[PDB]
Amino acid sequence: ACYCRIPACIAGERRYGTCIYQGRLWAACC
């Protein structure tokens, strides 16, 4: 599954895109 994260993905995840909520930009991390 993919998670929304700030400021970076966590261990063993890779960034594939972006989430938008609460007026902020999140890394989509899978």
PDB file of N, CA and C in Angstrom:
ATOM      1  N   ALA A   1       0.857  -1.234   0.000  1.00  0.00           N
ATOM      2  CA  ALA A   1       0.000   0.000   0.000  1.00  0.00           C
ATOM      3  C   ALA A   1       0.863   1.243   0.000  1.00  0.00           C
ATOM      4  N   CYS A   2       0.268   2.362  -0.405  1.00  0.00           N
ATOM      5  CA  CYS A   2       1.031   3.601  -0.454  1.00  0.00           C
ATOM      6  C   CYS A   2       0.562   4.572   0.595  1.00  0.00           C
ATOM      7  N   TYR A   3       1.534   5.248   1.199  1.00  0.00           N
ATOM      8  CA  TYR A   3       1.315   6.188   2.296  1.00  0.00           C
ATOM      9  C   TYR A   3       1.674   7.583   1.864  1.00  0.00           C
ATOM     10  N   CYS A   4       1.104   8.570   2.540  1.00  0.00           N
ATOM     11  CA  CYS A   4       1.473   9.974   2.349  1.00  0.00           C
ATOM     12  C   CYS A   4       2.394  10.405   3.493  1.00  0.00           C
ATOM     13  N   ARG A   5       3.573  10.922   3.140  1.00  0.00           N
ATOM     14  CA  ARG A   5       4.557  11.233   4.150  1.00  0.00           C
ATOM     15  C   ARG A   5       5.274  12.559   3.943  1.00  0.00           C
ATOM     16  N   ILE A   6       5.598  13.231   5.050  1.00  0.00           N
ATOM     17  CA  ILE A   6       6.475  14.412   5.069  1.00  0.00           C
ATOM     18  C   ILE A   6       7.474  14.144   6.228  1.00  0.00           C
ATOM     19  N   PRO A   7       8.791  14.380   6.017  1.00  0.00           N
ATOM     20  CA  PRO A   7       9.426  15.051   4.861  1.00  0.00           C
ATOM     21  C   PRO A   7      10.023  14.088   3.826  1.00  0.00           C
ATOM     22  N   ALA A   8       9.891  12.793   4.066  1.00  0.00           N
ATOM     23  CA  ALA A   8      10.505  11.812   3.178  1.00  0.00           C
ATOM     24  C   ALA A   8       9.848  10.479   3.435  1.00  0.00           C
ATOM     25  N   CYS A   9       9.993   9.543   2.498  1.00  0.00           N
ATOM     26  CA  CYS A   9       9.523   8.182   2.748  1.00  0.00           C
ATOM     27  C   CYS A   9      10.315   7.559   3.889  1.00  0.00           C
ATOM     28  N   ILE A  10       9.708   6.556   4.519  1.00  0.00           N
ATOM     29  CA  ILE A  10      10.407   5.794   5.569  1.00  0.00           C
ATOM     30  C   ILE A  10      11.228   4.602   5.016  1.00  0.00           C
ATOM     31  N   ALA A  11      11.945   3.888   5.887  1.00  0.00           N
ATOM     32  CA  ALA A  11      12.844   2.831   5.409  1.00  0.00           C
ATOM     33  C   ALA A  11      12.100   1.787   4.573  1.00  0.00           C
ATOM     34  N   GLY A  12      12.723   1.345   3.480  1.00  0.00           N
ATOM     35  CA  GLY A  12      12.129   0.378   2.570  1.00  0.00           C
ATOM     36  C   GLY A  12      10.946   0.862   1.746  1.00  0.00           C
ATOM     37  N   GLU A  13      10.717   2.174   1.694  1.00  0.00           N
ATOM     38  CA  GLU A  13       9.722   2.767   0.776  1.00  0.00           C
ATOM     39  C   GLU A  13      10.418   3.528  -0.371  1.00  0.00           C
ATOM     40  N   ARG A  14       9.704   3.718  -1.470  1.00  0.00           N
ATOM     41  CA  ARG A  14      10.184   4.579  -2.544  1.00  0.00           C
ATOM     42  C   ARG A  14       9.077   5.546  -2.878  1.00  0.00           C
ATOM     43  N   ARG A  15       9.488   6.741  -3.273  1.00  0.00           N
ATOM     44  CA  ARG A  15       8.556   7.778  -3.680  1.00  0.00           C
ATOM     45  C   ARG A  15       8.076   7.611  -5.120  1.00  0.00           C
ATOM     46  N   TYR A  16       6.760   7.587  -5.313  1.00  0.00           N
ATOM     47  CA  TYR A  16       6.200   7.478  -6.670  1.00  0.00           C
ATOM     48  C   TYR A  16       5.307   8.632  -7.117  1.00  0.00           C
ATOM     49  N   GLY A  17       5.019   9.557  -6.210  1.00  0.00           N
ATOM     50  CA  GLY A  17       4.135  10.665  -6.525  1.00  0.00           C
ATOM     51  C   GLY A  17       3.919  11.561  -5.325  1.00  0.00           C
ATOM     52  N   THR A  18       2.737  12.194  -5.305  1.00  0.00           N
ATOM     53  CA  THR A  18       2.421  13.254  -4.357  1.00  0.00           C
ATOM     54  C   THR A  18       1.007  13.083  -3.816  1.00  0.00           C
ATOM     55  N   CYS A  19       0.815  13.384  -2.530  1.00  0.00           N
ATOM     56  CA  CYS A  19      -0.547  13.561  -1.996  1.00  0.00           C
ATOM     57  C   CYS A  19      -0.781  15.039  -1.707  1.00  0.00           C
ATOM     58  N   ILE A  20      -2.046  15.434  -1.804  1.00  0.00           N
ATOM     59  CA  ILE A  20      -2.503  16.780  -1.431  1.00  0.00           C
ATOM     60  C   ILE A  20      -3.637  16.679  -0.417  1.00  0.00           C
ATOM     61  N   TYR A  21      -3.393  17.186   0.785  1.00  0.00           N
ATOM     62  CA  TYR A  21      -4.438  17.367   1.793  1.00  0.00           C
ATOM     63  C   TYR A  21      -3.951  18.349   2.861  1.00  0.00           C
ATOM     64  N   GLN A  22      -4.902  18.936   3.594  1.00  0.00           N
ATOM     65  CA  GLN A  22      -4.588  19.956   4.608  1.00  0.00           C
ATOM     66  C   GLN A  22      -3.683  21.065   4.084  1.00  0.00           C
ATOM     67  N   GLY A  23      -3.813  21.360   2.788  1.00  0.00           N
ATOM     68  CA  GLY A  23      -3.039  22.463   2.187  1.00  0.00           C
ATOM     69  C   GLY A  23      -1.559  22.192   2.076  1.00  0.00           C
ATOM     70  N   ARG A  24      -1.190  20.918   2.191  1.00  0.00           N
ATOM     71  CA  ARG A  24       0.216  20.537   2.130  1.00  0.00           C
ATOM     72  C   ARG A  24       0.457  19.466   1.078  1.00  0.00           C
ATOM     73  N   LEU A  25       1.719  19.348   0.695  1.00  0.00           N
ATOM     74  CA  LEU A  25       2.189  18.375  -0.309  1.00  0.00           C
ATOM     75  C   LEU A  25       2.966  17.286   0.379  1.00  0.00           C
ATOM     76  N   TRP A  26       2.525  16.065   0.145  1.00  0.00           N
ATOM     77  CA  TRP A  26       3.073  14.877   0.788  1.00  0.00           C
ATOM     78  C   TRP A  26       3.731  13.978  -0.255  1.00  0.00           C
ATOM     79  N   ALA A  27       4.812  13.288   0.109  1.00  0.00           N
ATOM     80  CA  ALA A  27       5.318  12.213  -0.748  1.00  0.00           C
ATOM     81  C   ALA A  27       4.395  10.989  -0.701  1.00  0.00           C
ATOM     82  N   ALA A  28       4.019  10.460  -1.889  1.00  0.00           N
ATOM     83  CA  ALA A  28       3.308   9.174  -1.989  1.00  0.00           C
ATOM     84  C   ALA A  28       4.382   8.076  -1.997  1.00  0.00           C
ATOM     85  N   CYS A  29       4.413   7.294  -0.910  1.00  0.00           N
ATOM     86  CA  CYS A  29       5.516   6.356  -0.635  1.00  0.00           C
ATOM     87  C   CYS A  29       5.018   4.933  -0.587  1.00  0.00           C
ATOM     88  N   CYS A  30       5.648   4.036  -1.349  1.00  0.00           N
ATOM     89  CA  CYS A  30       5.142   2.671  -1.513  1.00  0.00           C
ATOM     90  C   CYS A  30       6.229   1.668  -1.307  1.00  0.00           C
TER      91      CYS A  30
END
